[PDB]
Design a protein around this ligand. Structure first.
Ligand SMILES: *[C@@H]1O[C@H](CO)[C@@H](O[C@@H]2O[C@H](CO)[C@@H](O[C@@H]3O[C@H](CO[C@H]4O[C@H](CO)[C@@H](O)[C@H](O)[C@@H]4O)[C@@H](O)[C@H](O[C@H]4O[C@H](CO)[C@@H](O)[C@H](O)[C@@H]4O)[C@@H]3O)[C@H](O)[C@H]2NC(C)=O)[C@H](O)[C@H]1NC(C)=O
Lengths: 235, 108, 156, 216
């Protein structure tokens, strides 16, 4: 019933600005408090900011490492809240989540304390800050040339930033699929591997293609993986 | 019961003086018993099916009536309220002749 | 739950609150009686040193009083006028309507001094101090009492 | 301003066990805690508001307790979908830097599962670029702890490989692990036998999968 969608994340160089947008639907936006909470890759959840509704004055509060560099605003006619990021530092590389403090939880706070309980969370967006340019992913097949059950994967190498998606046979094969998380190589670029397990007798009859989609570099590449029996009857 | 208060405490941290049973040793003796500050037992009751908030509302809606009662009586301290409520509970069912298959008769 | 005495023809039992005996009949509140029984009747030492060794001072516990309708004639009762060495009273004056135990053959009246290290004097065994149709957890000044305990009965 | 500390940091229990996580506060707080469930890759989902209060839709096995400085979260009987990282957050004052706890990741316990082992040599299209990446796959195994060692011509190699662990699957509580080994083209064409050897509790003896360059 209630849904929130974050957008605007991307790669920005240290010291640059970036604008994040949060769209909300399914509730009374003008009476609810909004908040931004970020999650670093290795630091857990970290609260960023808070904005009240137009009823309570709409005062804004920021975090200590955040004050003076960010600015929150809200549009009630469009049910949207915006977060502006200026003079950004490398420690702010995180996954940003947009949260709402509904009017119903205002009613459960009885001691009238300013703190809030975060009701609903959106998908979140990725914000990466690093002194490097975008790079396209490398797709290489992994041939299956073991018994009754066999395994088949394709490898993605030297891609930056992180957002990558892999779908085998345009999503027709969803069972037994394992897509491993990214691992940082010594060169500064990441490496990902995608696997799917299939019966051995089906490799000669089916055609398996992995579809790799990479939004930052706008690179969508698909590759067909194919396998040993001696064909020695030549003259 | 519709809770019409501006805000509600969903949690009930209740204290009472009824003993929970299994009194240890001879601690029931007033000489060896606890002081006036340590005779209470506590408990936590969460908001289930919207009960807690409703309870508060009930108290609110009771207040007026209760006040009127305290206006009528001349007791400096009134302790016989629950007992009177029980007496009225019994009179409601068995105060008059209990006709079988009747609305005011609770039989089988 | 407070034990209720069940009286039959030459039978006494504790009323079982879990059980329900439909043959038991309570047709009037006159059948309900509260009775005070004297520790004397259980063979306790009545000499002043033992009795006073059964009592002790304590603060922090508010006194409590419960009525009883009938009591037992005592051979030995006690009446205390105790002060601290500084002359101040150790025991409070009898509240309004608390009179002495009505039937005492011997009243043991003890006067003197003590440290009285506590706001009220209680019974160390949890018994009651029986007065004129009022039973108290504490000793009042200058007021004759008997040591006892309370039972509740339904009379036939 | 306000410090929250969870315990334990990691937890492993079986399906149907009673799980209890503790959240401790630095200052005095009267039932302002909130329990959030965050499954890997998804957003945190609010489970408990204030103390012992379940959000509409949360199953009955979740329960909260406690007030003051210490708070307790209890799951009566674990279920496969309960695998997630749970967080406790205070709402007593305006949130500080340490308002959210570090988090407690719950892990489901099952029978020891033997890993299915495969090995994938580098592709010719990848060999054309000047870099080689051999893959060693261990899928469908519990627990997560396993030993992967690369041996090129019976010589143990270190510092040139990387591991990657998949989160616990939702249907079957089984992990998957991938080992990627990166070498240059010249050093790859210098040796004949390549083997990845794995040790795990589900296998009586550690097993090794090997291949030669250009084999069938
Ligand atoms: C209801 O009725 C019961 C039954 O009588 C009463 O319980 C009695 O309480 C008195 C309290 O003073 C007890 O008397 C004291 O007992 C001490 C220990 O002996 C008993 O306890 C141990 C441990 O349980 C038993 O193993 C033992 O067999 C005895 O049963 C004595 O040490 C006390 O002092 C004695 O020594 C001193 C010297 O230091 C002398 O000065 C004393 O005069 C005395 O000789 C004292 O005797 C009595 O034992 C209890 N009866 C029992 C346990 O059966 C309840 O108090 C009563 N309640 C009410 C409200 O009336």
């Amino acid at each position: 019933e209630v849904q929130l969608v974050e957008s605007g994340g991307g790669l920005v160089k240290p010291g640059g600005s970036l604008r994040l947008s949060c769209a909300a639907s399914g509730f009374t936006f003008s009476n609810a408090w909004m908040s931004w909470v970020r999650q670093a890759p290795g630091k857990g959840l970290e609260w960023v900011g808070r904005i009240k509704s137009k009823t309570d004055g709409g005062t804004i509060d920021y975090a200590a490492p955040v004050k003076g560099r960010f600015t929150i605003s809200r549009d009630d006619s469009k049910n949207t809240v915006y977060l502006q990021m200026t003079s950004l530092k490398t420690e702010d590389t995180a996954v940003y989540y947009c949260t709402t403090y509904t009017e119903d939880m205002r009613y459960f706070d009885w001691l009238l304390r300013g703190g809030e309980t975060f009701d609903y969370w959106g998908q979140g967006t990725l914000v990466t800050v690093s002194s490097a340019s975008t790079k396209g992913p490398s797709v290489f097949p992994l041939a299956p040339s073991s018994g009754g059950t066999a395994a088949l994967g394709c490898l993605v190498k030297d891609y930056f930033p992180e957002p990558v998606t892999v779908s085998w046979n345009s999503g027709a094969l969803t069972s037994g699929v394992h897509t491993f998380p990214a691992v940082l190589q010594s060169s500064g670029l990441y490496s990902l591997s995608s696997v799917v397990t299939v019966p051995s007798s089906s490799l000669g009859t089916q055609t398996y293609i992995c579809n790799v989609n990479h939004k930052p570099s706008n690179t969508k590449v698909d590759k067909k993986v194919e396998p040993c029996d001696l064909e020695v009857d030549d003259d | 019961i519709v809770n019409a208060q501006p805000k509600c405490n969903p949690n009930l941290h209740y204290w009472t003086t009824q003993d929970e049973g299994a009194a240890i040793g001879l601690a029931w003796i007033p000489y060896f018993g606890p002081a006036a500050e340590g005779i209470y037992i506590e408990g936590l009751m969460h908001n289930q099916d919207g009960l807690i908030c409703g309870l508060r509302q009930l108290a609110n809606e009771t207040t007026q009536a209760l006040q009127l009662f305290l206006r009528a009586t001349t007791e400096l301290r009134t302790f016989s309220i629950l007992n009177r409520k029980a007496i009225d509970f019994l009179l409601q069912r068995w105060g008059g002749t209990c006709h079988i298959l009747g609305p005011d008769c609770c039989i089988e | 739950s407070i034990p209720l005495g069940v009286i039959h023809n030459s039978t006494l039992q504790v009323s079982d609150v879990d059980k329900l005996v439909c043959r038991d009949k309570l047709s009037s509140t006159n059948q309900l009686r509260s009775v005070g029984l004297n520790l004397e009747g259980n063979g306790v030492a009545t000499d002043v040193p033992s009795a006073t060794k059964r009592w002790g001072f304590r603060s922090g516990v508010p006194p409590k009083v419960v009525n009883y309708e009938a009591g037992e004639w005592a051979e030995n009762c006690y009446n205390l006028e105790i002060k601290k060495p500084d002359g101040s009273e150790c025991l409070p004056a009898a509240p309004d309507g608390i009179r002495g135990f009505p039937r005492c053959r011997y009243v043991h009246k003890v006067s003197g001094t003590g440290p009285c290290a506590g706001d009220f004097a209680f019974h160390k065994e949890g018994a009651f101090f029986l007065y004129d149709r009022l039973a108290s957890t504490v000793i009042y000044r200058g007021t004759t009492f008997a040591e006892g305990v309370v039972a509740f009965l339904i009379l036939p | 301003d306000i410090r929250l500390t969870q315990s334990p940091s990691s937890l492993s229990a079986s399906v149907g066990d009673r799980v209890t996580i503790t959240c401790r506060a630095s200052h005095y707080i009267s039932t302002y805690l909130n329990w959030y469930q965050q499954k890997p890759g998804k957003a945190p989902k609010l489970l408990i508001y204030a103390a012992s209060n379940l959000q509409s839709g949360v199953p009955s096995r979740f329960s909260g307790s406690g007030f003051g400085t210490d708070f307790s979260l209890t799951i009566s009987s674990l279920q496969p979908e309960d695998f997630a990282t749970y967080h406790c957050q205070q709402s007593y004052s305006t949130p500080g830097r340490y308002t959210f706890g570090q988090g407690t990741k719950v892990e489901i316990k099952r029978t020891v599962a033997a890993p299915s082992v495969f090995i994938f040599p580098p592709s010719d299209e990848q060999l054309k670029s000047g870099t080689a990446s051999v893959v060693c796959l261990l899928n469908n195994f519990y627990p997560r702890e396993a030993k992967v060692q690369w041996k090129v011509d019976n010589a143990l190699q270190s510092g040139n490989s990387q591991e990657s662990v998949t989160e616990q699957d939702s249907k079957d509580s089984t992990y998957s692990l991938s080992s990627t080994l990166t070498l240059s083209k010249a050093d790859y064409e210098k040796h004949k036998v390549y083997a990845c050897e794995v040790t795990h509790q589900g296998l009586r003896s550690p097993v090794t999968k090997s291949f030669n360059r250009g084999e069938c």
